[PDB]
C-alpha cells in the first residue's frame, strides 16, 4: 500500500509526487523542466518509469484556467486533452485542478510552522476561508466546510475592478485606464502589477519611467535607492491588505485569510513593516467585523502537492 | 403535521404565514404591527389562534445579525432568547435567521414569473449563486449547492470599498471620503447611497445640495425633473452592474446573480433603460467569463417567508 500521483505544474516547471492514499502524506517529490519535454504526459511517463509503484489515480494542479477537457497553459506552451492523457496513462481517476484550488485544499492540513501570522486573533473553526496571492497574476479561491466536506470555491476574483482609496490611487487608476481599458486588481496586485504602479507613479509626477522589471522594483525599494520604487512597493502592500479585507467581509471568512507566496516572500521584512494590516482593517464601521480575523502567509513549500492529494482523496471517498 | 410557521420580522411589522411542509408552498400570510404587541411570541400566539392551526416547527426571518441565542432586536423590548421562545411555544424546531439570508434561501423556490432577467444565458444548475440588494443598506450573500442542499454563506460584502471606474466617480469617491472616512459600496448603493451620490454630484459642479430624501432622488430621476437626481440614479444603475459582475467573478457564480428588491422595483423602467447590464460585463478580457451569467431581479411579494420555509424544510431533511 498504496500511492496516487500528484503534481504541481506552473510556469515552466513540473513538480510531480506520490500521495499515500490512506494518509495524504506526500513523498518522492521531483521537479522537471517543462522546457525539456513535449508534454505533461511525457514527464509523468518518466516519473512513473522511475518509481515502480503501480498508480491508478492522479490529481495534478496547474496554474491555468481549467474548464473543459482541453487544458491550455498560460505561461508555458503545453496543451492537452484530459480524457486522452487519462486514457494514455493507466488511469482510473485523473483530476486536473487550478493551482489555487490545490492551495485552498491544502489549508486545513497546514500546521503553525507552515504559517506566518499578520494581525488578528485566532480562527473560528469550521468557518469559511479566503486564499489569495499576488504572483504572475492575482489568484483567489475560497474554502467552506459543509458536513465533514471541504468544498473549494474557485473563481476569477483577481479580475474584479481595482478599488482606489485616495486621490493618488485614483490618478493611478485613470493613468492605467487610459492605456489599458478596464483596470482590475490584478493590474496592480501581481508581478506585472508592481511595474504598473511604478510607471503610473512616475507618469503622475511628470517624469519618464525606466523599463524596470519586478525584481528591480523590489530591490531598489528594499534598498531605498529609488523613492518611486519604494512607493510602488509601499502602495502594493496597502492595496493588498485592503483587497484581502474585502475578501473577508464578502464571504465572512472567520476561518482566516491566507496568502499563497507569489512575490511577497522576497520582501517579507518590508511587507511586515508596511501598512498591510492597517489597510486590511481600514473598513470604517466594519473594522470590528474583520479586526480579529487572522491573515497568514503560507510558508509550507508544496501546498500545491498537498492540496491535490486532499482533493483526490476526498474525490475517492476519504474524509480529510 | 401539515404546516410549519414562517415569519419575516422587521422594525415595525411582523409578517407570519404557514409553510406547507410537503411542498414548501406559503399561505395565509398576515402582517401585524409591532407597536400593537409586547413581544414576537405574543404575535405568534395571536396568529395561531386566529388561524386555528397547530404547528411544531418554525422559522422566522429577522432584520438583524443572528449570532447567538440572544436576538438583539431593535424594538428593543422585543429582544428574546431563541431557546426561551422555542420552549415557551411547544416547538420541536425553531430556526431564526437573518432576513437577507432568508431572501437568499428563497431563490431555489423562485419561478420564472418571480424573476425579471437582465442578460446572460440559462443558469448552470447547482453552481454558486450571488445575491445582493440595495435597500436601506446593501446586503450581499452567496449560495452553494452541496449534497443536494443549498447552503447559504452570509457576510458583510456590502461594506467592501466602493470601486469607482471614472474620473467623475473618483471625484465622488474623494468628496465622500472627505466627509466620512471609508467609502463602502453601501455608501453609494442603497437609498441613503442615492442621497450621497446626489450631494457629491451637486458639490462636484460647485453648487449646494438640498436635504433630499432617497424617494426624492428616484422620483425626480423618473420624472426627468432634476439633472442631479437623474445623474445620481444613472450612476447607481451602472455601479450596481459593476458590483454584481465583481461578485460573479469572485465566486464563479454560474448559478446566477440575483438582486433582492429594495429600492429598484420603484424605478424598474428607469433601471431597464439604464447601463446596468453593459456595466456588469465591463471587465476587460473577463467580459467573456460573465457574458453568459444571468442576472435576475427578484420580484416575489414575500421571498423572506418563502426562504424561511426553504431553510426550515432543509433543516427537517427535505430536498428543495
UniProtKB/Swiss-Prot annotation, chains A, B:
* Sequence positions that bind ATP: 7-12
**Which segments of the protein form a coiled coil according to its record?**
none
Q: What GO molecular-function term can you cite, just one?
A: D-glucose binding
Catalytic activity, per the record?
Answer: D-glucose + ATP = D-glucose 6-phosphate + ADP + H(+)
Cellular localisation: Cytoplasm
Class of this enzyme: transferase
Q: Which UniProt keywords apply?
A: ATP-binding, Cytoplasm, Glycolysis, Kinase, Nucleotide-binding, Transferase
- Pfam families (alphabetical): Glucokinase (PF02685)
Q: What happens when the gene is disrupted?
A: No glucokinase activity, no growth phenotype in an otherwise wild-type cell.
A GO cellular component annotation in the UniProt record: cytosol
Q: What does this protein do?
A: An ATP-dependent kinase that phosphorylates glucose to make glucose-6-phosphate, not active on fructose, galactose or mannose. Not highly important in wild-type E.coli as glucose is transported into the cell by the PTS system as glucose 6-phosphate.
Q: What is this protein called?
A: Glucokinase
Which organism does this record belong to? Escherichia coli (strain K12)
Q: What is the lineage of its organism?
A: Bacteria, Pseudomonadati, Pseudomonadota, Gammaproteobacteria, Enterobacterales
Amino acid at each position: 500500500t498504496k500511492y496516487a500521483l500528484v503534481g504541481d505544474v506552473g510556469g515552466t516547471n513540473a513538480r510531480l509526487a506520490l500521495c499515500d492514499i490512506a494518509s495524504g502524506e506526500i513523498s518522492q517529490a521531483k521537479t522537471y523542466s517543462g522546457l525539456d519535454y513535449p508534454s505533461l504526459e511525457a514527464v509523468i511517463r518518466v516519473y512513473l518509469e522511475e518509481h515502480k509503484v503501480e498508480v491508478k489515480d492522479g490529481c495534478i494542479a496547474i496554474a491555468c484556467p481549467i474548464t473543459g477537457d482541453w487544458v491550455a497553459m498560460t505561461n508555458h506552451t503545453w496543451a492537452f486533452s484530459i480524457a486522452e492523457m487519462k486514457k494514455n496513462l493507466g488511469f482510473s481517476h485523473l483530476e486536473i485542478i487550478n493551482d489555487f484550488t490545490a492551495v485552498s485544499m491544502a489549508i486545513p492540513m497546514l500546521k503553525k510552522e507552515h504559517l506566518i501570522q499578520f494581525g488578528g486573533a485566532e480562527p473560528v473553526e469550521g468557518k469559511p476561508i479566503a486564499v489569495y496571492g499576488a504572483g504572475t497574476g492575482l489568484g483567489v479561491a475560497h474554502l467552506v466546510h459543509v458536513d465533514k466536506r471541504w468544498v473549494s470555491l474557485p473563481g476569477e476574483g483577481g479580475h474584479v475592478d481595482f478599488a482606489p482609496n485616495s486621490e493618488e490611487e485614483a490618478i493611478i487608476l485613470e493613468i492605467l485606464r487610459a492605456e489599458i481599458g478596464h483596470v482590475s486588481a490584478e493590474r496592480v496586485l501581481s508581478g506585472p502589477g508592481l511595474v504598473n504602479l511604478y510607471r503610473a507613479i512616475v507618469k503622475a509626477d511628470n517624469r519618464l519611467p525606466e523599463n524596470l522589471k519586478p525584481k528591480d522594483i523590489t530591490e531598489r525599494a528594499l534598498a531605498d535607492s529609488c523613492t518611486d520604487c519604494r512607493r510602488a512597493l509601499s502602495l502594493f502592500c496597502v492595496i493588498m491588505g485592503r483587497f484581502g479585507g474585502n475578501l473577508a467581509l464578502n464571504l465572512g471568512t472567520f476561518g482566516g485569510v491566507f496568502i499563497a507566496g507569489g512575490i511577497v516572500p522576497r520582501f517579507l521584512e518590508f511587507f511586515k513593516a508596511s501598512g498591510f494590516r492597517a489597510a486590511f482593517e481600514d473598513k470604517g464601521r466594519f473594522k470590528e467585523y474583520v479586526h480579529d480575523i487572522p491573515v497568514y502567509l503560507i510558508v509550507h513549500d508544496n501546498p500545491g502537492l498537498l492540496g491535490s492529494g486532499a482533493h483526490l482523496r476526498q474525490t475517492l471517498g476519504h474524509i480529510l
